[PDB]
């Protein structure tokens, strides 16, 4: 099985799972720990934001790879916004201050 781009979910904007749905591989917690054991910080940031969650980030990354530029924008993952909206529905006030 192999995949560059494809369909995404509704609630959490992530790639699907399975060969029949044309899904992608899962980068679990142990792979994150193995990347943290190296000095590979940009690879983990690319795996966590552009390749998985950030819609604007992955569209700008696709346009930059098509144009020929190897540069990405971190942005904000959508799963963190889903987590904030789900914790905020329990009557607990959590927000990013600046």
């Amino acid at each position: 099985h192999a995949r560059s781009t494809g369909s995404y979910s509704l609630v959490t904007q992530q790639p699907l799972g399975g060969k029949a749905q044309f899904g992608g591989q899962r980068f679990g917690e142990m792979e994150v720990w193995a990347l943290e054991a190296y000095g590979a910080a940009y690879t983990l940031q690319e795996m966590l934001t552009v390749k998985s969650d950030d819609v604007n980030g992955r569209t700008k990354m696709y346009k930059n790879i098509v144009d020929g530029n190897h540069q990405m924008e971190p942005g904000m993952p959508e799963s963190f916004n889903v987590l904030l909206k789900e914790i905020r529905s329990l009557g607990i006030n959590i927000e990013l201050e600046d």
Binding site: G39, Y42, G68, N69, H70, Q71
Partner: protein, 74 residues
């Protein structure tokens, strides 16, 4: 080709800033279109930047004074 990068690690202090310096050098050739110092042999900008680190013609201070001369020129 660059199988090992030990001569690039021997120049700068550790291996972590080597990635940042080589990325800052490689972004000038693909986006800025600057001509490299070492003659390329069917290589991408990563291998050219690593060879420029290995030959000792590129470091942090050289890129800093080159950016300073570019700011003073324009």
């Amino acid at each position: 080709a660059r199988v090992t990068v030990q001569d690039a690690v021997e120049k700068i202090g550790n291996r972590f800033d080597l990635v940042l310096v080589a990325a800052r050098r490689a972004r000038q050739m693909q986006v800025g279109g600057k001509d490299p110092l070492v003659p390329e042999e069917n290589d991408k900008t990563t291998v050219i930047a690593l060879r420029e680190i290995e030959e000792g013609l590129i470091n942090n201070q050289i890129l800093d004074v080159r950016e300073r001369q570019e700011q003073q020129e324009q």
